C-alpha cells in the first residue's frame, strides 16, 4: 500500500487548491480515505468512507470537498476559500479498505499547503 | 502485518450478541423480573439500560473502533490507566476459569440427553441416595432428593463426596473430558482470529434463538404455562419503592451487557473505521435485554407447568441460576412428549449461549495481550493455546468433587466488585481524564457526527455515577460466602477477597509504576501519565489540557 500526495503549494487567502492522493495496493472506492493536516497536533480534515460518505471537520466544512476517482485510484481534496489557518502539511491516510480487509492506517509523506 | 477487519459486519454484530447473551439472560433475569414486581421490574431495568448500559456499551465500542487496540493498549490515550486494562484482562481470565465449567456442565447434560431414558427422570442409579423420591409423588426447588437434583449434585457434581472447600477431591474424569471438549472448541474457534470467530458466532449466537422460539411455542401450550407467565409479568408498582429492586436491575444491566469488560473494546478494535458503532451499540444492547425478556416467557411457561404438575404455586418452583436449568428444566423436560428432543435442544441452546461468551472473554485476553506484546500478536495459535490451556488447568479446580465451592467463590469474587471498579476506572479515564469532548471528536472523525449532549452527559456523570452506586452497593451488600447449607470457612472468604483484590490493585500498582518509571519532575510525570502517548511531545511545551479547568468543565 502506497499513498502519494500532490497539489500543495502557495496560494492566496480565499484561493482554491486541489490536493491529490494517488493510491496503490488497494482500491480507494471501498477504502476509508482520510485527510489530516499538521500546522500543532495532526488534525483530521475530511474523509471519504467505504460507502462513499464524505465527512468533514467543522473547521473545513463548507470549504473543502473530498472526492475519489475509482478509475485513477485517486482521492481528491478540493480546498476552496482557503485561509492562513489552513496552512499545514496535509496527509492522506487510508484507515482500512473495508470489512474483509486490513487496518492499513498507512500515511503519505504529506503535501505542504501555504496560504498567503 | 496490519490488523485484519471483520469479514462482515454481521460477524462483528453476532460476536457482540453472542458475548452479551448467555445463560444469565435466561436464568437470572426472568427470576429477578418475577421477584421484583414482574412488569414493573422492567422500569428500573430499562432505565438503567438507557442511562448506563447503552452509554457504556457505546463508549466501549467507539473506543475500540477509534483506537483499534485491546483493553490494555487502548490506554495510550491516558497512560496511567493501563492498569485498568490489565485488571480487565485478569478478570476475564479469572471468569473463564469457572465459566467454561458451566459450559462443560451443559455439555455433560447434552451427552446425557442422547438416550430415550434420561438419567434425571428416575431413581435407582448409582448416584441416587436411598432418599431419592419419584417427583410425581412430591420450596420445591430446595428439595434435594429428586431424580433431577440428585442427578445434578451426585452424578454430575458428585458434591456428596466433598464435605467442603477444604476437601475438594480430584477432578472428575467425565467433567474433565467435557471441559477438554469445551476448551478445544474454544481454541479452534479462537486460534485463527476473528476471521473464523465471526463465522462461528453465526451458529453459536443464532442457534439459541431458534431453540428459544421452539421452547416458547411448546411452553405456551403447556398446562399451567399461562399461570407462570402471569406470575412472570404480574405488575406490582409498589415494589419500585424498595432499593433492592433498583439494585437488582442495576446489577443485572451491568453484568448482562458486559460493557467495559474488555470484550467489546477488542471486538470493535477489528471494525472498519467507517462502521456506525452507535447503531451497533443501540441494537446489540436492545437485543440483549429483549432476549432476556423473551426467554423469561419460556422459563416461566415451564415453571407454571411444573407448579401445575406438582400442585404447588409458582413461588415454590420459581428458581434461578444453575438450579433452574440443571434441575427444574430437566425435570420438566422428562415429563414432556419427546423428552429426548427437548433435552437435546435445551442443552445445545445452553452450550450455544455459553460458548460465544467464553469466546468473547478469551478474545478480550488474547487481543489485549497481543496488542501489548508483539511476540503474542505474531504467534496467535501458540498464544491462544496458552490461554486456553491455562484456562483448562485452572478450571480443573471447579470440576473437582468440591468444585461447586470453588465455582461459587470464583463466581462471587472474580468479576464482582473488581470488574465494577475496573469499569468505573475505564469510564473515568475516558470521560474525565482523556475527555468526553476528545471522545466526541474521535467519534465524529469516524461517523461524521458528534454524540449528542445526552451521551456525553451519560458518559461523564451518569454512567460513572451508576457504576459508583453499583460498586458501593456490591461492597455494602456483601454476604459471606455460602453455598446452599454450606458456609465457607473464613480462609475461603479471605482467598476470595484476595482474588478480587488481585486485579483491582493493578490499577494503583500500574499508576505507581508508570509514575516512577517516567523521568522528569512530579508535574512532568503526571502530564506524561495523563497525556496521550502520541501527544507527549507537548508536555515539554507545558501545554497540557488536563492542567486547565476548561478540560474538566468540558461536557
Ligand atoms: C495475566 C493477565 C493479567 C494481565 C497481564 C499483565 C502483564 C503486564 C506485564 C508488563 O509488561 O507490565 C509492565 C509493568 O507493569 C506493572 O508492574 C503493573 C502491571 C508494564 O509495562 P508497559 O505496559 O509500559 O510495557 C508494555 C509491554 N508490552
Ligand atoms: C470477564 C469477561 O467476560 C467473560 C469472560 C469469560 C467468560 C465469560 C465472560 O462473559 C460473561 C461473564 C463476565 C463476567 C463474569 C461472569 C460472566 C458475561 C457474558 N455476557 C456478557 C457479560 O459477561
Ligand atoms: Cl439480562
Ligand atoms: Na448477558
Ligand atoms: Na453467549
Author numbering:
A (entry chain B): 2 to 40, 43 to 119
B (entry chain A): 54 to 191, 201 to 617
List sentences quoted exactly from the publication behind this structure.
Norepinephrine (NE), also known as noradrenaline, is an important neurotransmitter that plays crucial roles in the central nervous system, including the regulation of mood, memory, and alertness. In the brain, NE transporter (NET, encoded by the SLC6A2 gene), a Na+/Cl–-dependent transporter, reuptakes released NE at neuron synapses, thus maintaining NE homeostasis. In this study, we report high-resolution cryo-EM structures of human NET (hNET) bound with different ligands in three distinct states: an NE-bound inward-open state, an NE-bound occluded state, and an outward-open state bound with inhibitors. Each structure consists of a monomer of hNETcryo in complex with one nanobody.
Based on the obtained structures, hNETcryo_reboxetine and hNETcryo_atomoxetine exhibited an outward-open conformation, featured by an open extracellular cavity. These structures are labeled as NET_reboxetine_O and NET_atomoxetine_O, respectively. In NET_reboxetine_O, NET_atomoxetine_O, and NET_NE_Oc, one Cl– and two Na+ were identified. The high-resolution structures of NET_reboxetine_O and NET_atomoxetine_O offer a solid model for understanding inhibitor binding. Both reboxetine and atomoxetine are NET-selective inhibitors. In this outward-open state, Y152 (SB) forms an H-bond with the side chain of D75 (SA) that also coordinates two water molecules and Na 1. The secondary amine group of atomoxetine and the morpholine nitrogen of reboxetine form an H-bond with the carbonyl oxygen of F72. In our study, reboxetine, specifically as the (S,S)-isomer, fits well into the cryo-EM density. Fitting of an (R,R)-reboxetine would result in slight clashes with the side chain of F72, assuming that the conformation remains unchanged. In both NET_reboxetine_O and NET_atomoxetine_O structures, the water triad is observed in the same position as in NET_NE structures, indicating their pre-existence.
